[PDB]
């Protein structure tokens, strides 16, 4: 358990780091968010299985559901920005500077 | 939007925060946060203009990152204490990360660069929701964990945001961005007094909401969105100038107006707790707010700006837009100090 | 250990067939043979350019419906409950809400491909 | 020399200047999410460091 | 077998590292598929079953839709892989070696703590009901139909509202 | 308060609508033939496809 | 009840009322093209409502007493002064043009509101779509400044996109020599000073922009002078038009509802015409504007709101 | 009333007599502006008058 | 009579007015009864 939790926390940390520093494509940022979602779900799953707490196993599934809903919203926003600018580049998202 | 979408979307925006403040479980508070986040975005992107889409994307990315950080805090607290609520024994880093991520959600500095842009992009009638209704949930999450927060971190964020909002207000000509910066400053006060006595944090939240909503409806009246544009109310709608002046001054926080009561009471509590340096600095820097509100007052009410030929037809045509709630909130926000003891 | 063994055996079999296919045949590599294929004429443009997806809305809707599938997949164990009435009511509400969402999307032309 | 010049420069105008300098220093942001999230990252690191050193 | 779980977690870390480095979305999806598989395996090894399989299923579907979206919008004339960009390659190797060295450092400073490479695999499972029957994670999850109906209500509402929100965002 | 950078900044549009440089729609150009099972051998149908 | 989301839910659906002759026809032509006769006759034969061309007094005539107000309140722009001196250094020309554009916008909003409410059709004499011809002609002649052109185009960009275009346009083509002949015959002392160059610029703008632009979406018919008479022929053509082309086809109840909500509030309609772009021709000084406003807000019936003016003949105020 | 016309795209006209009278009269009007000697005028007027009479 | 567009608020909405006045009188009656009851209960619980 301890080593697994350490590596999983490091994985979430790396995915958060990847989200915080961009790299042009918004789709990649969405994927990094989705990876953090994966890591958090795994954390919860292993914690519950370790503790034999079967009343908290309803909660990782809720995590997945809500993360899926937000990911769908993100994809729709990607579609709209693409319709606006021709690409998904985050550079174009600079109008509101003024 | 068709009626059924309006019903469902507005109902979900209303539901999210209610779940957050009526949930005993951290995962359910997170569910409320996600409800608000998901449901607001379609209202933001309702216009479907290039600026609107970009504002919605900025909001989405920032809020999603904040929610994930909060969820990490929840999961680690679970790993530690086998429960879904923060306890006195909970690791300090978990609470630090929660405060940090809820700060990002709230828009507090130095995570504040996102709020001005989104507010500028989005229309006024949704700017009101963004700067009023969407703060209740995160601040509730903090208030439910107030005894465990970190005084150093909270005071640092609060003073940072006071300074940043005050400085940012000056430069901006846009009303939407000005109201965003005012939001930042008032939230700075709210969080400054949160760890010591959350009742006054809630008092400040109430008064700020009761002052911002009237101002946002005032802007909606003529869709004003710039200093120059609002300068034409002496011609388009003279009646409102008096209350607009009073309300801007109150938000600034002059004594006779209500706006004093939040700042004065918060300074009093901080002094009781021996927070003299931070209290002094915050009070001092809360005067740039009065400056960049007084500029607006000068532009609108005390001086008469040049008008256009075509405003004559605006004069000719009739108007039926100001609500009863405008008058109620405006008076009850700018003429209530003598009832202050009952408020606190 | 059995599942790992059999899956690794399958992997090794497939990879061995590939390696034999790549190291047994006699080869002759030249530019015209290697260049891409497009009905006997040269590519007017590379295939990496944007390719509009005319079913984007249905594609996203698939995500949410699959998560609904996830929410429903516990039913075989759920039915072994004592609160059968509660389980029935909850499952009925879930499926009816699924149906209403699909019906609204249909009536709103979500499933009609975008041109 | 004093009343119309030096006092105005020292007390009012110095303050006015400094605050204008600070607003023009802070407000003008290029408006790009990449840079904004880089700053958020620096906040992340700073909070971590403060927590660690203060123990 | 002693190093089974630790190896799986390290592979998960590497897949997440690649995703963070953010190659083209196609390689991002491939990396996340591998990471989802490894995470499902970790959950399976920790006594789970339904949860691991569910993550794998939902993630396969999600990456399918994501790939479809990438081919249409998130595309470039020359997509960049992990190895194409020399900085990405160098930092991939740097991250791998850095994690190795960090593992060693934590082991040395805390001989028993976050990591116990000596004594690894000795604490995977803590307790098991030897003679039980109803101990399968599917039961706990299905509890949403009886003891946690609030969870079901909120999640179902989330999906329902998602339908309308998505339609009106894409209008 | 204009500064070095803010000189090139311009006032925002009155209505939020912003005039944008046109995004030319570049349909892909497929070669449905000559050698296609449905081209009957000798047709270089230069299809211009969107999606 | 004010038309709102509530009424829309409970009924009042526009598609429930639309009919075959519920259209938005625009009669257009050069000056003295006989537009008014044809407009009235089309409206009468088709059973629709005719809207006279917007003048400098349109808002005053359509609001309050319905009596023409003073020019100081109604724009301070004089068509006669324009003709007498078109390059006057008091900027009357562009003031007149902007006022006329705003009044045409108001008339268009009213006609669209009428169509979407009663379901009846509307006939109009020129409109915001056709208005740019006069501005282009003034600019080409040299009466207005390039900044004024910029300003007008900006306002049109802000306003025009919101409203649906007319169903059909009916352009009467009459050559410039005969335009001058008709103007001489009409014998308006100030109108007789309009120059042939000005008339030809109006005609060029019409043909080379408006008709090509309108034919893209609306149904455009062109009648020469000899065909213009006998309006019954034009009514027949309108009757056997088939509108498969235009933004109108893709509307539905909810789009109509949002358009109705926009038009119903005349303030929102005219909001962007008052953008604070400081152009001297339209800009008014604080003192003059204040004087005009104080004078207006004490005219008989214009001090308080429509329903609360006790002087004109309103009562039950203490309860209203 | 005819339900359909065999030709595709050519839809049924409810008021055929009115439409025909209108079109034929319009043609006869536009013809007046041809020179009176025009062979086109003569022939087209004969044709149109015949069909209008029918 | 004076106005061309029929004044929106031409005659009072008797319904809205009657509701407002009735609510006001009901509120005053309820408040007075409540104040009397509160005084009586305060005396009852504090021995006059
Ligand atoms: C500490 C914890 C406690 C915290 C407590 C909370 C603290 C306060 C929370 C923060 C307060 C902010 C609240 C924001 C409210 C909404 C703001 C807004 O954008 O609306 C502007 C709104 C404009 O309404 P309007 O002027 O009547 O517009 C005319 C409508 O178009 C007229 O036509 P309409 O029919 O379309 O009207 C709108 C329509 C739309 O309704 C919907 O879309 C949803 C339901 C649709 C059903 C179909 O609703 C209906 O009429 C029902 C349809 C039947 O004005 C306000 O509501 C602001 C009032 C201020 C409230 C602040 C109170 C603070 C105390
Ligand atoms: C204090 C901040 C002053 C900001 C400057 C406000 C200002 O310049 O006024 C507009 C001024 C333009 O005035 P105007 O062009 O002659 O026409 C505006 C009138 O509303 C033209 O409308 P009107 O003639 O139809 O209505 C006149 C209205 C008179 O209403 C007014 O226009 C004056 C309202 C401001 C009164 C300030 C009271 C000071 C409180 C002392 C404590 O009614 C009366 O004649 C007597 C009624 C009793 C006074 C109304 C008080 C009701 C609200 C009380 C709230 C108190 C808040 C504190 O600029
Ligand atoms: C169960 C059914 C599925 C089975 C799939 C596996 C198929 C197994 C087939 C068994 C036959 C194995 C011999 C295959 C040789 C095929 C390639 C070949 O012919 O190369 C000739 C080559 C030709 O020799 P060469 O190189 O001197 O020919 C001249 C070369 N050029 C043209 C360049 C001048 O000979 C070999 O070296 C092949 C060695 C095969 C061992
Ligand atoms: C610590 C540094 C991590 C790697 C830095 C990569 C280069 C960089 O500039 O950081 C920002 C980077 C975006 O870089 P880019 O827009 O592609 O422009 C490069 C200009 N030389 O942003 C990124 O590429 C994301 C980097 C994520 C790194 C995750 C793994 C770090 C392991 C240590
Ligand atoms: C001990 C504590 C008490 C002392 C407190 C002192 C605080 C006083 C603050 C006064 C601020 C007034 O701010 C005032 O802004 C106006 C704007 O019109 C400036 O006005 C001036 O600015 C610049 C000169 O620098 C000129 O280009 C400009 O044309 C002119 O108007 C004044 O120079 C400044 O003084
Ligand atoms: C301890 C906190 C105390 C806070 C209290 C003091 C409040 C200070 C107010 C600062 C803002 C004053 O705002 C003041 O604006 C004027 C113009 O309006 C600026 O002055 C400006 O004038 C013109 C442009 O207008 C330029 O030629 C000049 O170079 C520029 O400086 C001042 O430099 C700025 O200081
Ligand atoms: N300078 C200017 N004059 C305008 C504008 N619109 C209309 N006018 C003027 O208004 C007058 C309208 O001419 P008319 O043709 O007689 O209008 P009408 O009577 O309704 O229709 P007609 O049968 O053609 O006469 C002309 O002098 C012109 C405008 O936008 N700018």
From Swiss-Prot, chain A:
**What Pfam families is this protein classified in?**
Oxidored_q2 (PF00420)
- Taxonomic superkingdom: Eukaryota
Q: Which reaction does it catalyse?
A: a ubiquinone + NADH + 5 H(+)(in) = a ubiquinol + NAD(+) + 4 H(+)(out)
Query: Could you confirm whether the keyword Aminoacyl-tRNA synthetase appears in this record?
Result: no
The residues that cross the membrane are 2-22, 26-46, 58-79
Annotated S-S bridges: none
List, alphabetically, the GO terms of the cellular component aspect: mitochondrial inner membrane; mitochondrion; respiratory chain complex I
EC top class named in words:
translocase
Quaternary context = Core subunit of respiratory chain NADH dehydrogenase (Complex I) which is composed of 45 different subunits.
Known role: Core subunit of the mitochondrial membrane respiratory chain NADH dehydrogenase (Complex I) which catalyzes electron transfer from NADH through the respiratory chain, using ubiquinone as an electron acceptor. Part of the enzyme membrane arm which is embedded in the lipid bilayer and involved in proton translocation.
Please give the name of this protein.
NADH-ubiquinone oxidoreductase chain 4L
Protein source organism: Mus musculus (Mouse)
Q: Which gene encodes it?
A: Mtnd4l
UniProtKB/Swiss-Prot annotation, chain B:
Residues spanning the membrane: 1-21, 25-45, 56-76, 92-114, 149-171, 178-198, 200-220, 241-261, 274-294, 324-344
Reaction equations catalysed: a ubiquinone + NADH + 5 H(+)(in) = a ubiquinol + NAD(+) + 4 H(+)(out)
Lipid bilayer topology: Multi-pass membrane protein
Q: Name one GO biological process term.
A: mitochondrial electron transport, NADH to ubiquinone
Top-level taxon: Eukaryota
The UniProt keyword set, sorted, is: Electron transport, Membrane, Mitochondrion, Mitochondrion inner membrane, NAD, Respiratory chain, Translocase, Transmembrane, Transmembrane helix, Transport, Ubiquinone
Enumerate the GO terms in the molecular function aspect. Answer: NADH dehydrogenase (ubiquinone) activity
- Enzyme Commission (EC) number: 7.1.1.2
UniProt cross-references to Pfam families, sorted A to Z: NADH_dehy_S2_C, Proton_antipo_M
Location relative to the cell: Mitochondrion inner membrane
The cellular component terms of Gene Ontology attached to this UniProt record, alphabetical and capped at eight, are:
mitochondrial inner membrane; mitochondrion; respiratory chain complex I
Main subcellular localization, coarse class? mitochondrion
Q: Respond yes or no to whether keyword Mitochondrion is given for this record.
A: yes
User: InterPro entries this protein is in?
Assistant: Complex_I_Subunit_2, NADH_DH_su2_C, NADH_UbQ_OxRdtase_chain2, ND/Mrp_TM
Q: Which PANTHER family match?
A: NADH-UBIQUINONE OXIDOREDUCTASE CHAIN 2
Could you describe the subunit structure of this protein?
Answer: Core subunit of respiratory chain NADH dehydrogenase (Complex I) which is composed of 45 different subunits. Interacts with TMEM242.
Family of this protein? Belongs to the complex I subunit 2 family.
Entry function: Core subunit of the mitochondrial membrane respiratory chain NADH dehydrogenase (Complex I) which catalyzes electron transfer from NADH through the respiratory chain, using ubiquinone as an electron acceptor. Essential for the catalytic activity and assembly of complex I.
* UniProt name for this protein: NADH-ubiquinone oxidoreductase chain 2
Q: Which organism is it from?
A: Mus musculus (Mouse)
UniProtKB/Swiss-Prot annotation, chain C:
| Pfam families from the UniProt entry | Oxidored_q4
The keyword Glycoprotein is assigned to this record: no
| Source taxon at top rank | Eukaryota
Q: What does the record give as the reaction this protein catalyses?
A: a ubiquinone + NADH + 5 H(+)(in) = a ubiquinol + NAD(+) + 4 H(+)(out)
GO molecular function terms here? NADH dehydrogenase (ubiquinone) activity
Q: What is its EC number?
A: 7.1.1.2
What UniProt keywords are attached to this protein's entry?
A: Electron transport, Membrane, Mitochondrion, Mitochondrion inner membrane, NAD, Respiratory chain, Translocase, Transmembrane, Transmembrane helix, Transport, Ubiquinone
**Gene3D superfamilies noted in UniProt:** NADH:ubiquinone/plastoquinone oxidoreductase, chain 3
Q: Supply one GO CC term from the record.
A: mitochondrial inner membrane
Segments traversing the membrane: 3-23, 55-75, 86-106
Protein localization: Mitochondrion inner membrane
The answer, when asked if NAD is one of the entry's keywords, is yes
How is it placed in the membrane, per its record?
A: Multi-pass membrane protein
One GO BP annotation of this record: mitochondrial electron transport, NADH to ubiquinone
Family, according to the entry, reads as follows: Belongs to the complex I subunit 3 family.
Self-association and partners: Core subunit of respiratory chain NADH dehydrogenase (Complex I) which is composed of 45 different subunits. Interacts with TMEM186. Interacts with TMEM242.
Q: What does this protein do?
A: Core subunit of the mitochondrial membrane respiratory chain NADH dehydrogenase (Complex I) which catalyzes electron transfer from NADH through the respiratory chain, using ubiquinone as an electron acceptor. Essential for the catalytic activity of complex I.
The name under which this protein is listed is NADH-ubiquinone oxidoreductase chain 3
Q: Which organism is it from?
A: Mus musculus (Mouse)
- The gene that this protein is the product of is mt-Nd3
UniProtKB/Swiss-Prot annotation, chain G:
Task: Show the GO MF annotations.
Answer: NADH dehydrogenase (ubiquinone) activity
Where does the protein end up?
A: Mitochondrion matrix
Looking at the Swiss-Prot or TrEMBL record, what is one Pfam family this protein matches?
dNK
Keywords in UniProt for this one?
A: Acetylation, Electron transport, FAD, Flavoprotein, Mitochondrion, Phosphoprotein, Respiratory chain, Transit peptide, Transport
Which InterPro entries does the entry mention? Deoxyribonucleoside_kinase, DNK_dom, NDUFA10, P-loop_NTPase
The listed outcome for residue 215 to D is:
Phosphomimetic mutant; able to rescue mitochondrial depolarization in a Pink1 mutant background
GO cellular component terms attached to this protein's record: mitochondrial inner membrane; mitochondrial matrix; mitochondrion; myelin sheath; respiratory chain complex I
**Which cofactors must be present for this protein to function?**
FAD
Q: Which GO terms describe its biological process?
A: aerobic respiration; mitochondrial electron transport, NADH to ubiquinone; proton motive force-driven mitochondrial ATP synthesis
How, per the record, is the cofactor bound? Binds 1 FAD per subunit.
What is the top-level taxon of the source organism? Eukaryota
PTM comment:
Phosphorylation at Ser-215 by PINK1 is required for the binding and/or reduction of the complex I substrate ubiquinone. Acetylation of Lys-207 is observed in liver mitochondria from fasted mice but not from fed mice.
Name positions with the PTM N6-acetyllysine.
87
Q: Which residues carry this modification: Phosphoserine?
A: 215
User: Which residues are reported to carry the modification N6-succinyllysine?
Assistant: 87, 250
Q: Which CDD domains match?
A: NDUO42
Family, according to the entry, reads as follows: Belongs to the complex I NDUFA10 subunit family.
Biological function: Accessory subunit of the mitochondrial membrane respiratory chain NADH dehydrogenase (Complex I), that is believed not to be involved in catalysis. Complex I functions in the transfer of electrons from NADH to the respiratory chain. The immediate electron acceptor for the enzyme is believed to be ubiquinone.
């Amino acid at each position: 358990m301890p080593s697994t939790f350490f590596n999983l926390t490091m994985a979430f940390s790396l995915s958060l780091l990847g989200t915080l520093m961009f790299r042009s494509h918004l789709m990649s940022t969405l994927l990094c968010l989705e990876g953090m979602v994966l890591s958090l779900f795994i954390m919860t799953s292993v914690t519950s299985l370790n503790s034999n707490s079967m009343s908290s196993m309803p909660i990782p599934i809720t995590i997945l559901v809500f993360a899926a809903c937000e990911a769908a919203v993100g994809l729709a926003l990607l579609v709209k920005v693409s319709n606006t600018y021709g690409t998904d580049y985050v550079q174009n998202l600079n109008l509101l500077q003024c | 939007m068709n009626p059924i979408t309006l019903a469902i979307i507005y109902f979900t925006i209303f539901l999210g925060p209610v779940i957050t403040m009526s949930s005993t479980n951290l995962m359910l508070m997170w569910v409320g946060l996600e409800f608000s986040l998901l449901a607001i975005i379609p209202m933001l992107i309702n216009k479907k203009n290039p600026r609107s889409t970009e504002a919605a994307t900025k909001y989405f990315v920032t809020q999603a990152t904040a929610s994930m950080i909060i969820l990490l805090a929840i999961v680690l607290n679970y790993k530690q204490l086998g429960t879904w609520m923060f306890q006195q024994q909970t690791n300090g880093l978990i609470l630090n990360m929660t405060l940090m991520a809820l700060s990002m959600k709230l828009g507090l500095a130095p995570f504040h660069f996102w709020l001005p842009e989104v507010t500028q992009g989005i229309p006024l009638h949704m700017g009101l929701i963004l700067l009023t209704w969407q703060k209740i949930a995160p601040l509730s999450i903090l208030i439910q964990i107030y005894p465990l927060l970190n005084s150093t971190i909270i005071l640092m964020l609060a003073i940072t945001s006071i300074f940043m909002g005050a400085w940012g207000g000056l430069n901006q000509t846009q009303m939407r961005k000005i109201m965003a910066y005012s939001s930042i400053a008032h939230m700075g006060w709210m969080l400054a007094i949160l760890p010591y006595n959350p009742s006054l944090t809630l008092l400040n939240l109430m008064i700020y909401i009761i002052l911002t909503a009237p101002m946002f409806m005032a802007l909606m009246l003529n869709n004003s969105m710039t200093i120059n544009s609002i300068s034409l109310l002496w011609n388009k709608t003279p009646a409102m100038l008096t209350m607009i002046s009073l309300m801007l001054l109150s938000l600034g926080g002059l004594p006779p107006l209500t706006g004093f009561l939040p700042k004065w009471i918060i300074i009093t509590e901080l002094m009781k707790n021996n927070c003299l340096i931070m209290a002094t600095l915050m009070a001092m820097m809360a005067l740039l707010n009065l400056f960049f509100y007084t500029r607006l007052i000068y532009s609108t009410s005390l001086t008469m700006f040049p008008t256009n030929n075509n405003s004559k037809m605006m004069t000719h045509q009739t108007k039926t837009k100001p609500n009863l709630m405008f008058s109620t909130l405006a008076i009850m926000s700018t003429m209530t100090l003598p009832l202050a003891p009952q408020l606190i | 250990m059995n599942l790992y063994t059999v899956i690794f055996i399958n992997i090794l079999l497939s990879l061995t067939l590939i390696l034999v296919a790549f190291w047994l045949p006699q080869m002759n590599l030249y530019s015209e043979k290697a260049n891409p294929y497009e009905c006997g004429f040269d590519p007017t443009s590379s295939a990496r350019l944007p390719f509009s997806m005319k079913f984007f809305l249905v594609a996203i809707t698939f995500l949410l419906f699959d998560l609904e599938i996830a929410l429903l997949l516990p039913l075989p164990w759920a039915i072994q409950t004592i609160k059968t009435s509660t389980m029935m009511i909850m499952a009925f509400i879930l499926v009816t809400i699924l149906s209403l969402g699909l019906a609204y999307e249909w009536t709103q032309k979500g499933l009609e491909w975008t041109e | 020399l004093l009343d119309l010049i030096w006092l105005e420069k020292t007390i009012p105008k110095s303050t006015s200047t400094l605050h204008t300098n600070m607003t023009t220093l802070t407000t003008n942001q290029k408006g790009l999410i990449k840079l904004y999230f880089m700053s958020f990252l620096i906040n992340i690191i700073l909070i971590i460091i403060l927590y660690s050193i203060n123990l | 077998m002693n190093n089974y779980i630790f190896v799986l977690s390290s592979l998960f870390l590497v897949g997440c590292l690649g995703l963070a480095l953010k190659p083209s979305p196609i390689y991002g999806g491939l990396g996340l598929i591998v990471s989802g598989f490894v995470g499902c395996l970790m959950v399976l090894g920790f006594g789970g079953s339904f949860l691991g399989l569910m993550v794998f299923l939902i993630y396969l579907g999600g990456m399918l839709v994501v790939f479809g979206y990438t081919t249409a919008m998130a595309t470039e004339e020359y997509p960049e892989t992990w190895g194409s960009n020399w900085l990405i390659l160098g930092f991939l190797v740097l991250g791998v070696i850095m994690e190795v060295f960090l593992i060693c450092v934590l082991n040395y400073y805390d001989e028993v703590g976050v990591i116990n490479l000596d004594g690894l695999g000795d604490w995977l499972m803590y307790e098991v009901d030897d003679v039980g029957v109803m101990l399968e994670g599917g039961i706990g999850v299905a509890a949403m139909y009886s003891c946690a109906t609030w969870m079901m209500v909120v999640a179902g509402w989330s999906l329902f509202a998602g339908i309308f929100i998505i339609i009106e965002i894409t209008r | 308060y204009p500064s070095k950078e803010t000189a090139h900044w311009k006032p925002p549009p009155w209505n939020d609508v912003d005039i944008l440089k046109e995004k030319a729609v570049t349909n892909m150009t497929l070669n449905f033939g000559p050698q296609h099972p449905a081209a009957h051998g000798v047709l270089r149908l230069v299809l211009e496809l969107s999606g | 009840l004010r038309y709102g989301l509530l009424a829309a839910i409970l009924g009042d659906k526009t598609t429930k009322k639309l009919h075959e002759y519920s259209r938005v026809i625009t009669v257009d032509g050069n000056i003295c093209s006989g537009k008014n006769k044809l407009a009235k006759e089309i409206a009468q034969q088709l059973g629709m409502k005719h809207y006279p061309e917007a003048g400098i007094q349109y808002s005053s005539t359509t609001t309050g007493d319905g009596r023409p107000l003073d020019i100081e309140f109604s724009g301070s722009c004089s068509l006669e002064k324009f003709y007498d001196d078109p390059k006057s250094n008091d900027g009357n020309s562009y003031r007149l043009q902007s006022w006329l554009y705003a009044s045409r916008l108001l008339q268009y909003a009213d006609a669209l509101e009428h169509l979407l409410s009663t379901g009846q059709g509307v006939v109009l004499e020129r409109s915001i779509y056709s208005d740019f011809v006069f501005l282009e002609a003034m600019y080409n002649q040299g009466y207005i400044r390039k900044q004024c052109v910029d300003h007008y185009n900006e306002i049109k960009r802000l306003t025009l996109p919101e409203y649906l275009p007319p169903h059909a346009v009916i352009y009467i083509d009459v050559p410039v020599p005969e335009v001058q002949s008709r103007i001489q015959k009409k014998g308006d002392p100030h109108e007789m000073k309009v120059t042939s160059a000005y008339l030809q610029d109006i005609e060029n703008a019409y043909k080379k922009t408006f008709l090509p632009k309108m034919s893209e979406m609306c149904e455009v018919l062109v009648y020469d002078s000899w065909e213009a008479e006998d309006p019954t022929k034009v009514v027949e053509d309108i009757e056997y038009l088939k509108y498969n082309k235009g933004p109108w086809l893709k509307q539905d109840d909810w789009t109509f509802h949002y358009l109705r909500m926009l038009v119903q509030d005349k303030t929102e309609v005219l909001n962007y015409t008052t953008i604070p772009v400081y152009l001297p021709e339209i800009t008014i000084g604080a003192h003059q504007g204040s004087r005009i406003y104080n004078s207006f807000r004490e005219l008989p019936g214009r001090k308080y709101a429509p329903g609360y003016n006790a002087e004109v003949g309103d009562k039950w105020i203490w309860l209203k | 009333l005819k339900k359909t016309t065999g030709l595709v795209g050519l839809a049924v006209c409810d008021t055929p007599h009115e439409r025909l009278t209108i079109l034929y009269t319009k043609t006869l009007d536009i013809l007046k502006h041809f020179p009176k000697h025009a062979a086109y005028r003569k022939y087209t007027e004969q044709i149109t008058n015949e069909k209008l009479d029918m | 009579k004076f106005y061309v567009r029929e004044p929106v608020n031409a005659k009072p909405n008797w319904l809205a007015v009657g509701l407002s006045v009735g609510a006001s009188v009901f509120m005053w009656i309820y408040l007075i009864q409540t104040h009397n009851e509160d005084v009586l209960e305060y005396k009852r619980r504090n021995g006059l």
